[PDB]
Ligand binder design. Sequence first.
Ligand SMILES: *Cc1c(COP(=O)(O)O)cnc(C)c1O
Ligand SMILES: *Cc1c(COP(=O)(O)O)cnc(C)c1O
Lengths: 317, 321
Amino acid sequence: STNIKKHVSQLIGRTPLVYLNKVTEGCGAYVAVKQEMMQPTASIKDRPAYAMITDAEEKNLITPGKTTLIEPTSGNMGISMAFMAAMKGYKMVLTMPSYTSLERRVTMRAFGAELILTDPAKGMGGTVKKAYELLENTPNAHMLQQFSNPANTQVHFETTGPEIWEDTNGQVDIFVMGIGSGGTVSGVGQYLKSKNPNVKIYGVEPSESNVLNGGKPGPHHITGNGVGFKPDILDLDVMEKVLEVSSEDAVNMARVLALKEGLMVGISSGANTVAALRLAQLPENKGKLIVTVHPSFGERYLSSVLFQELRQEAENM
Amino acid sequence: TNIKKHVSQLIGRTPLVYLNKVTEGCGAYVAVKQEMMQPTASIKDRPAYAMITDAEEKNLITPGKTTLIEPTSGNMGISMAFMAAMKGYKMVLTMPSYTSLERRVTMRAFGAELILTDPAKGMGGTVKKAYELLENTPNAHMLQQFSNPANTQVHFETTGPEIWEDTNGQVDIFVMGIGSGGTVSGVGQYLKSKNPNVKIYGVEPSESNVLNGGKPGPHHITGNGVGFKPDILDLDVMEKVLEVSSEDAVNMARVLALKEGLMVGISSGANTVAALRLAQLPENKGKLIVTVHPSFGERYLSSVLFQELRQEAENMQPVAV
Ligand SMILES: *Cc1c(COP(=O)(O)O)cnc(C)c1O
Ligand SMILES: *Cc1c(COP(=O)(O)O)cnc(C)c1O
């Protein structure tokens, strides 16, 4: 009878595409960007988070008020999981290294997640072990496992990809996306292929941490991208190749997107756009429609390198 | 849809959602309009677009030529910087040197020029400074948010009609905080032109209840209670102005995140408190009450909203593995 949503989770998905007009000077191709900032949590994460918790409910694995959900994660998957746990009324326990961002930790707590900070000296391996110890010692507990839970890939197959196919009226020639868990690129990749097999799909990863192109893992600044190993759910075969983008270029492009397109986006959005533009400058792609994603809102990263210059220029005055 | 041509086409058309956890069992329907879904994540994108577009159309300004000046910070500064970056205008925002570093960095990221003024002159100093700039700069134009009727008009033309459409004409009551008064005036006039029985309430801080005859004063409801009656604000359209304390608005905002999954600001809290207060009244049982959550809460990580959480987080220690 009305267009009023019954649930906050119904605000998830169905996000807009926008053409880039300024930054695309000298490109034979059209680039459009999917804006995931328009979600309850202001990041792409909201999709997998809903999908994993909901899938586990339908399979009768978890019960609200009785199951303790456990996950070794932080950074915008942690925020989305905390968010979902709040809406559906699950106890959510998140393990992370103590050197984790204070801004992320405060945000996850605002939704009621319990945080356990593990010893810094043991890094990620520490939080994963901690989370497994808690899973084994907690009576009604369940771990989501974002890197191997196929409901992660499935959500993009059923919502992210179909949205991209519909909004471009079947015209998308090329899809570019950074790899984190690999869920987005794998799920959108498979869906687009099943509609038109000539659609080219590309991954993006940091130059400084290029493990999928045979490099060694290492620190980088493309937040959300490049975990340093191959996730189980990542589908290597659906991609033409994994493009590499340096942190420097991704950072610079993110700044430009704000100044010239009015898109306040993160470093990951930066890297995707760099990859898209350079595909868009290739002669064979002339006239083609290339789609990429801006996975989250830029204001989340106010204390990162993205606003480094602005932050200190503003301190001095 | 098809692909949009400009980011500005993503302004407006925000969804309504029912609250069901903070509202048990207040006896009325409460739906909240989610303004976080805007390019700058606040309802300040509507007015900023309308005021700049209005001036272009009356040929008072031109991109590349005109310098836009405005004494503002907060959500309206961010939105103003955002609309200038997009349309191609040089933008000058004056503000007290005490304004939040994060807001300033955000305004800078869109390319606005910032001029900070004496911490002792408060708002007056920034306004005085802005008027000097206006008179000392060739081809300068000041937007004037508190006295520009294009502010009210955008809510009459978008925000109001959206609420009437999404509720399929069933809205009985609309509650909204007053900053400039644009939203409450514009939505009010619209809704009442569709159904005169619609009740429109404004909201202000207890600590600065000027519209109720009190004296101005420091409060924590960011975006709300500017300490005087803005010119564009239409008092006649409201039944009255409800007062909400800062403590209550803050508590409501924290509870909205924990129970409803809505990460919103202190102004969203204040509006939701007022909405619940109306639900308590006998004449409002069974009615559809609509209010607004004007912004995303992550913007206020440095405010009193997050204070308890920041301290608790500072004090967490690692555990052994
Ligand atoms: C998750 C994430 C990605 C990568 O998405 P995946 O589906 O996990 O591979 C890219 N950018 C940001 C900001 C992300 O949060
Ligand atoms: C700007 C604003 C308001 C009030 O809107 P007006 O139309 O100016 O009265 C309320 N809350 C927040 C967060 C705002 O930015």
